[PDB]
Design a protein around this ligand. Structure first.
Ligand SMILES: [Mg+2]
Ligand SMILES: [Mg+2]
Ligand SMILES: [Mg+2]
Ligand SMILES: [Mg+2]
Ligand SMILES: [Mg+2]
Ligand SMILES: [Mg+2]
Ligand SMILES: [Mg+2]
Ligand SMILES: [Mg+2]
Ligand SMILES: [Mg+2]
Ligand SMILES: [Mg+2]
Ligand SMILES: [Mg+2]
Ligand SMILES: [Mg+2]
Ligand SMILES: [Mg+2]
Ligand SMILES: [Mg+2]
Ligand SMILES: [Mg+2]
Ligand SMILES: [Mg+2]
Ligand SMILES: [Mg+2]
Ligand SMILES: [Mg+2]
Ligand SMILES: [Mg+2]
Ligand SMILES: [Mg+2]
Ligand SMILES: [Mg+2]
Lengths: 117, 70, 66, 153
RNA sequence: CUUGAGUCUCGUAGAGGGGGGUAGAAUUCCAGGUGUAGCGGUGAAAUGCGUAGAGAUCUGGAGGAAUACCGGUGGCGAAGGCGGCCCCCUGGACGAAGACUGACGCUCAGGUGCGAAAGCGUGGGGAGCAAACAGGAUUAGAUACCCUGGUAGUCCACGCCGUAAACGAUGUCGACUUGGAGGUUGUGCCGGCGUGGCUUCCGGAGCUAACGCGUUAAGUCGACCGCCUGGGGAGUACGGCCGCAAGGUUAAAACUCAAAUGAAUUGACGGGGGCCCGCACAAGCGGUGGAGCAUGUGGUUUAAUUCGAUGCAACGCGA
RNA sequence: AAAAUG
């Protein structure tokens, strides 16, 4: 389909998983991959290596779009925070912007109760 | 932490800048602290404990200044 | 350290003085601790109120991600 | 051990070919201290392999070893109550030790008449990536690859 | 009379209180666009959500609750408590010069008021969270801990309740008695030198069973009040008062025990911490557990199957 | 992960 050459990678890096969505600059998804959906289930899913494979698979999933440049939007505390960015650079994309978008309340809603393990 | 990669600046250096920007802004600490509710009594206790232990460690420092170990 | 407001006889910090206030916020827009900039506590309080007033009037950002 | 001042033992090279590595292979094949028995087995099997490869004894043995030597193995570690398989690199001496032990083990579980014939057959199979020694190396590599994510500590 | 107590003048810092408005971040929900097979969760899972298109991402909207950073053994308040910004109404504290009143003070049974959270009543509101409840796990069970959900409630107005390890486990007021380092907030003089208020840490004499307290006393004294009299029974019963209720408050007796208790000491222990060691793990090689037999033991049997050893440290042991 | 008792 249509070519883009200027995309945004969104990295949803939670403690349990990593989701990589590459959209255009308007926020329209072009492709996505996840650590869980890349052959990693459980203890392996929440690892930096799983996030790296997911980012590799996501880059393969948008190859037909001829995307050349990428702004990276990193959201969350998980282990796939930077390994995804390394994978995106190593797939030949030109990273022109790295931004943290982790939502921080300026107090806000009450969190769930602490776990007693 | 909004990093714009500079001309002729390699990718690893921009990544290090992004990391330092995140640490300075303390985003990860904010997310950790906000994951579960900490009761006000718990928070006051922990703040007081941090102040007490900081003061006591400096006391330990300034007093080991005098002590000779051998 | 040393406090720039004590050394200048500042009565109030003037939320309108954007150029001064920008030295007391981070890139993310957050108020810098007085332990880093060396501001005195009285002036740190005035400075926080001024920054919040300026944020309200959109003379300063709350965050870097509006 | 805890203290670790283990200094290595000197191995006399094998008498016919003057190889340390074949000497260790004899040691690994030997049972009950019967070294001459094991030596005769290895020498007979190496003669057979040399004939069936037309190359050399040590060179054909090395071909087999290259096909059995692992490069990465897995080490267990309990982490959060569960057990993880952690991939680690194999030091070269351990590479040879594992290859030789796997070949001897695989030879012993073959069905041929004498041990020397089983060893020759296993070595030839290894030289063409076929027998159960190379299969063991393959499963070890497969486990390490499946656990590449845990390469960190 | 003016020194205690108070009034006035100028000013200072403050999350002190009441009312009203508003800002930005975020969660959730609703609508739509892109997009596609997963998401979510755990120690591991499953329940749950998703091809009726989730999750992810972008836009628009709704709504409630709380105010990141500042922020601090920082500040204010009688205590409970109080945190975005702005206005309105309002309480207290402190400082410098004076001027004024002239003991007008301190404490306080009964009384009265205030009083966290939960709870209760009426009327609203309800994002997030979350007793109850449901399901999934775990387990021998698991009416839990963990997971997915979720209702009171949490929020608002008004009234009620009147209790908390409501703690400094330390009543209020006043005087006196070596020091050190800080914080915060005034003020005098000229960065230094003073002088007030509040406050954190350490420590001297003294005090203390000790631990400790130590000019903000648990030191040295004075005024007034509250309270205690071995552990249980019991802050319970009965009665009274209060409450819509939940319950609060006042508050026994029989009976029973020879202790209960505080602090500190030596050990031992810990699914507390740290550092080491050992064929303890690990890396390996050969075994035992299966077979036949030898031998010892248990048991059973017997007239007797002599006695002893009988977790590791008895069982080819005394022999 | 679970991990009771004398
Ligand atoms: Mg959770
Ligand atoms: Mg009375
Ligand atoms: Mg309430
Ligand atoms: Mg109600
Ligand atoms: Mg209601
Ligand atoms: Mg729950
Ligand atoms: Mg009480
Ligand atoms: Mg309290
Ligand atoms: Mg007290
Ligand atoms: Mg009390
Ligand atoms: Mg009084
Ligand atoms: Mg002291
Ligand atoms: Mg009662
Ligand atoms: Mg009663
Ligand atoms: Mg072992
Ligand atoms: Mg047997
Ligand atoms: Mg006997
Ligand atoms: Mg006897
Ligand atoms: Mg006996
Ligand atoms: Mg005996
Ligand atoms: Mg014994």
């Amino acid at each position: 389909r249509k070519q883009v050459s200027d995309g945004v990678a969104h990295i949803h890096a939670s403690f349990n998983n990593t989701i990589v969505t590459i959209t255009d600059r308007q926020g329209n998804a072009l492709g996505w991959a996840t650590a869980g959906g890349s052959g990693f289930r459980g203890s392996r899913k929440s690892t930096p290596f799983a996030a790296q494979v997911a980012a590799e698979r996501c880059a393969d999933a948008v190859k037909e779009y001829g995307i050349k440049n990428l702004e990276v939007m990193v959201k969350g505390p998980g282990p796939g925070r930077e390994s995804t960015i390394r994978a995106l650079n190593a797939a030949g994309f030109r990273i022109t912007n790295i931004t943290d978008v982790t939502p921080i309340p300026h107090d806000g809603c009450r969190p769930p109760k602490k776990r007693r393990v | 932490p909004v990093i714009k990669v500079r001309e002729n600046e390699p990718f690893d250096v921009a990544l290090r800048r992004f990391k330092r920007s995140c640490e300075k802004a303390g985003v990860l600490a904010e997310v950790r602290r906000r994951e579960f509710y900490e009761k006000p009594t718990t928070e006051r206790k922990r703040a007081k404990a941090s102040a007490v232990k900081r003061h006591a460690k400096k006391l330990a420092r300034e007093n080991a200044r005098r002590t000779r170990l051998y | 350290k040393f406090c720039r407001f004590t050394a200048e006889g500042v009565q109030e910090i003037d939320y309108k003085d954007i150029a001064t206030l920008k030295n007391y916020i981070t890139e993310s827009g957050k108020i810098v601790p007085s332990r880093i900039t060396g501001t005195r506590a009285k002036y740190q309080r005035q400075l926080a109120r001024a920054i919040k007033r300026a944020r309200y009037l959109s003379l300063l950002p709350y965050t870097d991600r509006h | 051990p805890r203290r670790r001042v283990i200094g290595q033992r000197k191995i006399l090279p094998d008498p016919k070919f003057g190889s340390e590595l074949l000497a260790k292979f004899v040691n690994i094949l030997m049972v009950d201290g019967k070294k001459s028995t094991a030596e005769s087995i290895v020498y007979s099997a190496l003669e057979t392999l040399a004939q069936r490869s037309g190359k050399s004894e040590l060179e054909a043995f090395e071909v087999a070893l290259e096909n059995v030597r692992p490069t990465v193995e897995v080490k267990s570690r309990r982490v959060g109550g569960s057990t993880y398989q952690v991939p680690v690199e194999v030091r070269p001496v351990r590479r040879n030790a594992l290859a030789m032990r796997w070949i001897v083990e695989a030879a012993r579980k073959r069905g041929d008449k004498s041990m020397a014939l089983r060893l020759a057959n296993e070595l030839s199979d290894a030289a063409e990536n076929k027998g159960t020694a190379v299969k063991k190396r393959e499963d070890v590599h497969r486990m390490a690859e499946a656990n590449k994510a845990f390469a960190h500590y």
